[PDB]
């Protein structure tokens, strides 16, 4: 337990990994600062040594490698396929509803984890709570998909705060917007894929 | 040498803290996902930052001369006679800015103020900022800026610096935020008007 003697917030709003002359350096967004050295992904517990690895953290999210179990979040599952797809959705998000529709034709190859987050506020919170508190989750999936979550029978003792953990977690780990799809190989789609089936195969 | 850049990746990092522990200074991202171990260099001032005072310095201070930025080359008007230069970024329609420039008049024996005009509030401020820049006779610029009469300053015959103000772009790039924005002689910044300008201006 080494103590931190001092901490200073630097005027850096962004960082690029830049490869040149057998080295990878870290250059700030307005180009004021360059850092020479080694970067370590504390969440996945590994050094990033190659540009493929830099590309990987920009492009992919590996929940298991980072020790994040999505089933512990406000999650409903659809399908029984051997490859797992993650989708962050708002209960009121129509594009999300459409995505969940396209996914029904894919349940033989994939198991979709729909992570419900009240990204759109107000009524979305009330809905996400109804999902989180529903007694019989076997009907949660259908209610989420039909925007009928409001009617779901609640557990007697279930009253979360307004700051939804799944939302906080998503915000924290860098999930932006809904729907947000993470393919089995970790590739992220910020929005609904043009064609879900093809996008999913790699 | 020189060598080409083979590859570039934008990393998911929105902020960086310098963190001192066990005799080294590490660079930790805003959500704690990444730590960079190694050496940071201020490319604008052309020096290594090796200590926490030096980290604090880039956090707290802006040193124009050291970064090769001559503020007199921006859209700038000067007031006063003092041996110490104070820099203030102002929008021509900014009431707080006007009040600051006003308080500054009582300090001209000790300081020379550089009022760098930026149309941060856009629209009508642009035309005013243009009018200053294109004023043929700059000896009346200070008074026009301070009396909010830049609209009437006679312009050079062929002068239209365009829709995007160079001073504004420069301020944005180097990270000057809001108006007024004060930089003391010792480089210390104030984002807003300091409570008392006179005392604040003295070295600290």
TrEMBL record, chain A:
GO molecular function ontology, one term from the record: isomerase activity
Localization per record: Periplasm
Claim: Nucleotide-binding is one of the keywords in the record: no
Domain Thioredoxin-like fold: 79-187
Alphabetical UniProt keywords: Disulfide bond, Isomerase, Periplasm, Plasmid, Redox-active center, Signal
Name of the protein in question: Thiol:disulfide interchange protein
Pfam families for the chain: DsbC_N, Thioredoxin_2
Disulfide bonds: 93-96, 133-158
Homology family: Belongs to the thioredoxin family. DsbC subfamily.
Function statement: Required for disulfide bond formation in some periplasmic proteins. Acts by transferring its disulfide bond to other proteins and is reduced in the process.
Any one cellular-component term (Gene Ontology): periplasmic space
PANTHER family: THIOL:DISULFIDE INTERCHANGE PROTEIN DSBC, THIOL:DISULFIDE INTERCHANGE PROTEIN DSBC-RELATED
Main localization (coarse): periplasm
